[PDB]
Amino acid sequence: MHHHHHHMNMLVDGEWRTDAHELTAGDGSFERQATTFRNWVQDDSDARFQPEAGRYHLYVSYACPWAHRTLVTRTLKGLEDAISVSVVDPYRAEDGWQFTPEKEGCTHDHVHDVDYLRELYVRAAPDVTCRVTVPVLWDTEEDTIVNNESEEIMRMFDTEFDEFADHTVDLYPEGYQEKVDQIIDNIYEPINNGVYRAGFATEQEPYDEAVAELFGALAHWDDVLADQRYLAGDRLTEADIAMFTTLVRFDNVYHTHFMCNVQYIREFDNLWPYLRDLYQTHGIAETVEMDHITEHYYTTHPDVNPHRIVARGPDLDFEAPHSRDEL
Amino acid sequence: HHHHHHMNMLVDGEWRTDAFERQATTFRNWVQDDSDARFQPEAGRYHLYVSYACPWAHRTLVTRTLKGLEDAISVSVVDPYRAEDGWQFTPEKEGCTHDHVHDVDYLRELYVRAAPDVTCRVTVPVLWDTEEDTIVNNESEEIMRMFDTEFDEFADHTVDLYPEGYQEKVDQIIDNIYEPINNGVYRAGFATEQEPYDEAVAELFGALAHWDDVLADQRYLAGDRLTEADIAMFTTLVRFDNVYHTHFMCNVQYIREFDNLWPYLRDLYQTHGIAETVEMDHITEHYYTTHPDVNPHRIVARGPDLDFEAPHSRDELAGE
């Protein structure tokens, strides 16, 4: 959420720029100058955005682990019929996230048929100063951006659309919520944001800390997952979805491209069968587009990988059997 | 050979940033233990120029230590950090020495001195004759066999890294792993197009899986005894999991993830003397800092926690 690639652009007072130097001195200063979108869809008769069956639209990239969080939840809940989705081009440049429908896995902007994602922001907030990112939950009635945060879109997908979900799945169950909210908050900095902090690191000391904290955090949850099947233990929750979207991209991208190369995830005793256990959860596998993932990270970051060569990566057997059902 | 995108060159004696191997001159003279030869083996005549980072130069160091020619043949260590002026001498720096021959600032000076208008790339290793005041040899394999066979009169240990009855296999292994393994990682690393990288990675890991199969039932590459072929493989393997895997994006599988290649590497490392010839800090610093078009912000990766010193069981297989 907080770390962005060296050539990432911006919208300033409703204007697309390649860089705004007056807002880019010091660690992530632009984001403290940025506006985000934090409205909620609430199952409440008084609420502004009430959950309907054919109203809200979702914008994602298959490569983004933050957007991927919304996709995994949408599939688990069975909200595809209820909530439509557009897939942006995994490759992006001077114009940010773009729509390339002819490209495999990508579609067109189902709402306004825009060329770029930045057009959608401008329509929703003509004077906005922010980053054009995914995911974006869009309301077709008010014609604007409802929410812009992976964590909260996942949550409201989980707890607010029960009337239209096809599956009786509860990824935020009673008695687990406090711990689920705890795990999500913990793994957020050393693991979710940690890999990008290490990858876009410009000095040695920040990289060292980002790597040390990361694999330290991974080792902790590896010991925790030795005696309990999931992060919150007995049940599959949002906490697992947050962890999964990072882990699934670690050995093909983060390890090499972002130089987080202390250890493979597949070398961990418990995290690797855990990742296989999640990947094989019915429906999740179809939300994983590795071709989108590898193409984005290896060819969209010029200052990290100049010649834009897509690395091959390990031959990962995600479909390899586990034994964590014995927990 | 595949060199990095910022690799400069010596052209007609001049030092230039911008312009090729097939347009370049090399040094291919030999030291021969024969009465007529131009360069004959002596006990305090030849000087070795190496970098602890470079695997090619690493071959000459390993062999030198094995035979016991540390007192016969002197050595200088250039600065792991290279730039606008090529390999340089920085005596203050840990592990580095000064030019013991002419107190030269940049290795390129020695090349020009030995050959006034040479067109070549300033590389290591460099075998230097302090009598004719010129470069003797310039290739890793030739200097290695030179150190191994011709200097028997000035050795300290009676080791034979090129023994009779095994020689024919030794030489063939050496040029069978040259392109896919030894030079392959650089082909993949400095690749600018997707297709060559795909090939380079494919042939490299195809080759690694092969010798991992072979070394499962035999202790060393040529079989029964330690060998120059093992020296060529070692200087690459010991730089894989820390550099080649990540920096050069050869990330299909760790060397430590192999059944046989990993204890085999631990077997070579722990052999007497080979432990001291490894300077991982020189290795990690050079590749992550001297390749601006491979690693722009020049951040040194942490790498895995490799325990080369961990006990193995390949002594169970018959060998030294």
Author numbering:
A (entry chain A): -6 to 320
B (entry chain B): -5 to 13, 23 to 323
How is this structure described in the published paper?
Glutathione transferases (GSTs) constitute a superfamily of multifunctional proteins widely distributed in nature and they are found in both eukaryotic and prokaryotic organisms. The main role of GSTs is the cellular detoxification of several xenobiotic and endogenous compounds, including drugs. Xi class GSTs form a distinct group of GST enzymes endowed with glutathionyl-hydroquinone reductase activity and show homology with the Omega class GSTs. The present work describes the cloning, expression, purification, crystallization, and structure determination of NmGHR, a GST of the Xi class from the extreme haloalkaliphilic archaeon Natrialba magadii ATCC 43099.
NmGHR was crystallized under high salt conditions and diffraction data were collected to 2.6 Å resolution. NmGHR displays the canonical GST fold with a N-terminal thioredoxin-like domain and a C-terminal all-helical domain. The protein backbone and relative orientation of the monomers in the dimeric assembly is remarkably well conserved between archaeal NmGHR and it mesophilic counterparts. Furthermore these values are comprised between 1.2 and 1.78 Å when directly superposing the dimers. These observations suggests that not only the canonical GST fold is perfectly compatible with halotolerance but also the quaternary structure, posing this class of enzymes as one of the most structurally conserved when comparing halophilic proteins to their mesophilic counterparts. As expected, NmGHR is characterized by an extremely high content of negatively charged residues which are evenly distributed throughout the surface of the protein. An interesting feature of NmGHR structure is that the histidine-tag present at the N-terminus of the protein chain to aid purification is ordered and visible. We could model in the electron density the complete tag including the initial methionine of chain A, and almost completely also of chain B. As shown in Figure 5A, the tag sits along a wide cleft between the N-terminal and C-terminal domains of NmGHR. However, it may also be noted that, under this framework, the amino-terminal group of γ-Glu-Cys is as close as 1.4 Å from the side chain of the methionine (-6) that precedes the hexa-histidine-tag. This suggests that, in our experimental conditions, the histidine-tag partly occludes the enzyme’s G-site, possibly explaining why our soaking or co-crystallization experiments failed to recover γ-Glu-Cys in the crystals. Therefore the absence of S-glutathionyl-hydroquinone reductase activity that we detected with the classical substrate for Xi class GSTs, i.e., benzoquinone, might be due to the position occupied by the tag in high salt conditions.
